[PDB]
Amino acid sequence: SAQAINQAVNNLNERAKTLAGGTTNSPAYQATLLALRSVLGLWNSMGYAVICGGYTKSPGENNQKNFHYTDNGTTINCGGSTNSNGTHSSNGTNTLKADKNVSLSIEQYEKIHESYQILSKALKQAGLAPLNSKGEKLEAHVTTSKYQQQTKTTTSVIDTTNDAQNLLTQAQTIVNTLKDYCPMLIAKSSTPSWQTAGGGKNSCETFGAEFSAASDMINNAQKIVQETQQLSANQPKNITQPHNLNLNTPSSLTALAQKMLKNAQSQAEILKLANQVESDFNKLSSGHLKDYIGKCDAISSTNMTMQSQKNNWGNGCAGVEETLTSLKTSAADFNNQTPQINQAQNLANTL
Amino acid sequence: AKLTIESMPLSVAEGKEVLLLVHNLPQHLFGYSWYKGERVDGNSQIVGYVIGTQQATPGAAYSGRETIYTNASLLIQNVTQNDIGFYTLQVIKSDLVNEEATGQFHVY
């Protein structure tokens, strides 16, 4: 009947309006946000240990580049080394070639740093834009340094946006750079439990599971965004003039009936993906990073210098536990609306 | 304590070989590199080795008779008079702290 078709269409559209354009009420949103925050968390937890500044063309093109992190700010030197007596050396990691299972090039580190800074600044300056929203433009700042014949600081401007698609791309760059090139990690001088003190572990050796989980979080979050635009551009129209057999022809009614199913199947896959992203967060957060990624509140390395002596390296400082609960609290609201959704799909299956 | 080099033989004959042994190599390394001359200088790099890798990456100074080993020693065969003088090893330990050491052999 007309009231039944109209009740189902309204339920789909009410849930679709929240799922697509909502923030705190949307598990699609909170899942995406979790993915983003999880990569920031990953980098904040173990980024400082990533060995960088191996040479790309030659050992005689000896380059360095320092990368700044602001907060209680810190700086990370790629290329150099620390001498026996404690002074800085311009010959260090740049004496050995950059590749898989060795060291990130300066070029690879500057992408992680750029991506991280865009992502960090976007989530603070403007939050994540809603998933159906086109996004809001915003300027990111990226502060680096080189050495001269004196040290030269340079802060770059990047015109970026806070739409999921862009922000997921930045996260993807961080995870895939680690996942694919597996740079070695710095050890303790004889701090997290995973940073050994003995030899020095390979990042994909230490964080293989975590990198895959972090990677899968992004792939699923992107899939959420694609099913959300499918959903957005697939809104069934309410039946008006119900008795009018010319206006409401069985053709454009079966069109609507299967337009409703596309709306429902997107919502299913989105909620399914969102629940996978939570499963993927548990994979990420329950190995080496269990006591680290979820919290925030003095650790060092020889390629690191702090403005003060505090800094927040070693633990995630990305509000992932807060976002995890928001994802759980939003997903149970949609998980109990399934009776309404299954009433509509069975009703739709008729036409 | 200190990283030191030893040339075997100490003085070499032209066309024969020399072995720069490494004493007191610290455990736990990221990698190391051998240089021609007194200075750690990129353009004089003969070869660099990374601990996980299995293969060593030569530099500009690689003449083609240099065999680095994974105990950090360097064999140089078919020595010329042009091989006279100093050779320098830089080690990068796992904590990114470097150590240096110089070697020399005299050819006759």
In angstroms, the CA A126 to CA A291 distance is 29
Phi, psi of A236 (to 5 degrees): -65, 135
8 A C-beta contact, residue A33 and residue A128: yes
Least Cα separation, residue B70 to chain A (angstroms): 15
Q: What is the 3-state secondary structure (H, E, C) of chain B?
A: CCCEEEEECCEECCCCCEEEEEECCCCCEEEEEEEECCCCCHHHEEEEEECCCCCCEECCCCCCCEEECCCCCEEECCCCHHHCEEEEEEEEECCCEEEEEEEEEEEC
CB contact under 8 A, A189 and B41: no
Across A181-263, where does the E strand assignment appear?
none
Q: If DSSP codes are grouped into helix, strand and coil, which group holds residue A21?
A: helix
Least Cα separation, residue A78 to chain B (angstroms): 11
Q: Which residue of A59, A62, A186 is in closest CB contact with B95? A: A186
Q: Can you give the CATH number for the domain in which B41 is found? A: 2.60.40.10
8 A C-beta contact, residue A293 and residue A280: no
* Domain residue limits, chain A: 1-351
Which tokens hold the place of A172? 């993807």
**B41 contacts in chain A (CB < 8 Å):** 60, 91
**A301 contacts in chain B (CB < 8 Å):** 95-96
Q: Which residue of A81, A97, A301 is in closest CB contact with B48? A: A97
Domain that holds residue B102: 1-108
Least Cα separation, residue B104 to chain A (angstroms): 21
Distance of CA A258 to the CA centre of its chain: 34
In angstroms, the CA A15 to CA A345 distance is 14
Q: Which residue of A59, A82, A199 is in closest CB contact with B97? A: A82
In angstroms, the CA A303 to CA A287 distance is 26
Burial of A283 from C-beta contacts in 10 A (0-12 / 13-18 / 19+): middle
For chain A, give the residues followed by a break (C–N over 2.5 Å). Answer: 71, 149, 190, 297
Give the experimental resolution in Å.
2.7
CB contact under 8 A, A82 and B48: no
Task: Give the residue from A279, A318, A264 showing the smallest Cα distance to A296.
Answer: A318
In angstroms, the CA A190 to CA A196 distance is 10
In angstroms, the CA A341 to CA A334 distance is 10
CB contact under 8 A, A95 and B53: no
Range B66-105 burial, b when 16+ CB lie within 10 A, else e: bebeeebbbebeebeeebeeebbbbbbbbbbbbbbbbbeb
CB contact under 8 A, B94 and A200: yes
Give the mutation candidate from B96, B97, B100 for the A interface (greatest A CB count, under 10 A).
B96
Experimental method: X-ray
In angstroms, the CA A46 to CA A41 distance is 9
DSSP summary character for residue A93: G
Task: Give the residue from A282, A164, A140 showing the smallest Cα distance to A213.
Answer: A282
**A102 contacts in chain B (CB < 8 Å):** 31, 50, 52-53
Least Cα separation, residue B13 to chain A (angstroms): 31
**B95 contacts in chain A (CB < 8 Å):** 186-189, 200, 301-302
CB contact under 8 A, B96 and A186: yes
DSSP summary character for residue A152: E
Residue whose structure tokens are 């702090």: A306
How many domains would you assign to chain B? 1
In angstroms, the CA A315 to CA A311 distance is 10
Range A54-75 burial, b when 16+ CB lie within 10 A, else e: bbeeebbebbbbbbbbeeeebb
Give the mutation candidate from A63, A95, A105 for the B interface (greatest B CB count, under 10 A).
A95
Least Cα separation, residue B48 to chain A (angstroms): 6
**A94 contacts in chain B (CB < 8 Å):** 42
